[PDB]
Amino acid sequence: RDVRREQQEIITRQINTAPYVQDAMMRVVVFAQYPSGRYKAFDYVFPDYLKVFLNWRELLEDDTRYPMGVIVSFNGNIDWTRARVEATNMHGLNNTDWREARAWGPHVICGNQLRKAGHLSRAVYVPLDEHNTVKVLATARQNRFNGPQLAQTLTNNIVCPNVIEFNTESDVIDYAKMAHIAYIDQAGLIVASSDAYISGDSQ
Amino acid sequence: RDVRREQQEIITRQINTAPYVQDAMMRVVVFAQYPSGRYKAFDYVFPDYLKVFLNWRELLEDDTRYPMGVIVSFNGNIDWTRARVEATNMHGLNNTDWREARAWGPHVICGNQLRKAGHLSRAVYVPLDEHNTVKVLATARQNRFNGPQLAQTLTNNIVCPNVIEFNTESDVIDYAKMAHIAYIDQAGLIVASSDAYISGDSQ
Amino acid sequence: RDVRREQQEIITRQINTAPYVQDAMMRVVVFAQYPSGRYKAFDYVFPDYLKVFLNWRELLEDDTRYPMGVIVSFNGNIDWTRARVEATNMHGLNNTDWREARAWGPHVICGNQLRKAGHLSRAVYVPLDEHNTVKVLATARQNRFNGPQLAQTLTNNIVCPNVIEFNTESDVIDYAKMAHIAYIDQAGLIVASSDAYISGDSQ
């Protein structure tokens, strides 16, 4: 008899399920934390796959200009068995001698290193030293990579990056909440998530 | 008996047909019109496919700094049934809530919204509001996306972008004419085209 | 009986062979030589393929600001029958009229124009005039482009570019030596290589 409630339930379910449709968007954000207490976010929206290399220059606030670390926030129907992050050297290498470097290092960040922030989101904190660059891979969960489809996947995958500066963690946090993306605050708490709740945190 | 004329005819036909060869170049230009009367062109040449995201910063003249709109000029052997443009928000999303956004919106600009500017060219005017970004997709008309070929298509597709500033529409127009690309002037007229004519506009 | 020597031999062989493993890194560097005697290097590390377009702006030192030419240094398990360089115009075209331009020009730089600098490295010097841009293609030697694999190749290919300024050729040379990449000095000599020697140049 409560169709108003049922409709609101389906709307909530729709929001939570819409990201699993084949042409849905995914969202990966790299939050960089600076000694000054400021943050910079590298915010990517994309439908199929995301390959990211952040060089040392882009990572500078613009070394107390260099981030103490990053929070990497993965959101959407992402293949969690392949999602990964690694901190490479200033050349983007995972071995100082390129001749023994590889696409990914033997200790790449993946698996349970990515903390669950809801069904749609995972987040990981990665400390950085002044000589680090950052690599991230995120792919849509299967298969759009197979056969004929790959061509449509390649041509339709327009990655839309934005860089956003925040004066304080409060701005970062409110941003994550209104953007519906995972974020871990300075105390280690999951303070934002992609998951829609019909009542919010009412328990 | 007029082989001089016949040769000139074949040269004209060669120019008009050369873009249909499998490794020919295509050219897509995004002309941004500013309140000041100045323009900025994002000029891309590419052989296989073009995926473009123009963020709000790139769109600024450098808000009366923000474009009133863009003319998107598509040129070459482009798949016209898939060529498309859309104006997304500042994040590159076609829904404010990313969880319900998709690679393309339900109202994407395509079909007869692209005005014929000759056999080789189509052009469309898209008005913009201060919070808009621009996405463009253009692919070569079929199949180089199929099977073994896809690899060569991926590896050979080097997109060559140039940004060009113009003080006035006259400079924009003369540029389009000498570049052989479609352009629509402020009065709505097609003033440039990719099509070569043996006598010019002699009728 | 000299296992210390044998171990060092295998280490040397390992260094020389490691680049031929399927997920090994490759390294392509474009060294730009300026009239001032300064250089700028565009240094790319990547595991599968590299498509590069350097526009006229990026080529400026920042016209005596424009390079006299570039040394292109290719390093790794690169498909040498497809490695190529070409100098295009300011639009990235190999014909002034785009309608008759192609992905590559009829005179592209390849084959024995690339000088052998060891088994792992080739290098070529390309003179430039003020109106030139630079294109480079390098692909991993086969097949990771075939069938199912192509998807992993596409998603794993994160190109990591760095731009590096050098005050003098000496800095360029020491860089190449410590980076283990091919470089040709001002006198035409191969002064750096990717090849590891157990004794260095002891002959």
Numbering used by the authors:
A (entry chain A), B (entry chain A), C (entry chain A): 13 to 74, 109 to 188, 193 to 253
Structure paper excerpt:
All polyhedra belong to the same I23 space group and the native crystals (at 100 K) mostly possess a unit cell of 102–103 Å (102.8 ± 0.4 Å). The exceptions were CPV4, which forms crystals with 2 distinct unit cell dimensions (101.7 and 104.8 Å – the structure of the larger unit cell is an outlier and is discussed below), and CPV17 which has larger cell dimensions (106.1 Å room temperature and 104.9 Å 100 K). Native crystals of CPV4 polyhedra grouped into two distinct unit cell dimensions, 101.7 (±0.27) Å and 104.8 (±0.18) Å, whilst all SeMet crystals had the larger size. Crystals with both unit cell dimensions were observed on each of several frozen meshes suggesting that this was not an artefact of sample preparation. In the larger-cell structure, residues 1–12, 75–108, 189–192 and 254 were not visible, however SDS–PAGE analysis of crystals showed only a single protein band, corresponding to the full length polyhedrin, suggesting that this is not due to cleavage. Residues 75–108 and 189–192 are clustered around the centre of the dodecameric assembly described above. In the absence of these trimer–trimer interactions the trimers of the dodecamer slide away from teach other, enlarging the unit cell. The volume of the central cavity increases from 7220 Å3 to 18,784 Å3, and the solvent plus disordered protein fraction of the crystal becomes 41% (compared to a solvent content of 19% in the smaller cell crystals). Since residues 75–108 form the base domain we wondered if polyhedra crystals could be formed without the base domain. The CPV4Δ structure was very similar to that of CPV4 with the larger unit cell.
Cypoviruses, members of the family Reoviridae, subfamily Spinareovirus, possess a single capsid layer with turrets and are commonly embedded in crystalline occlusion bodies called polyhedra, which are formed in the cell cytoplasm and mainly composed of a single virus-encoded protein, polyhedrin. To ensure the delivery of virus particles to the target intestinal cells, allowing the transmission of packages of infectious virus between hosts by oral-faecal routes, polyhedra are disrupted only when they are exposed to the very alkaline pH environment found in insect midguts. The fold of all the polyhedrins is highly similar – a β-barrel core sitting on a base domain, surrounded by a common array of five helices (H1–H5). The strongest intermolecular interactions define a trimer composed of a cluster of three β-barrels sandwiched by helices top and bottom.
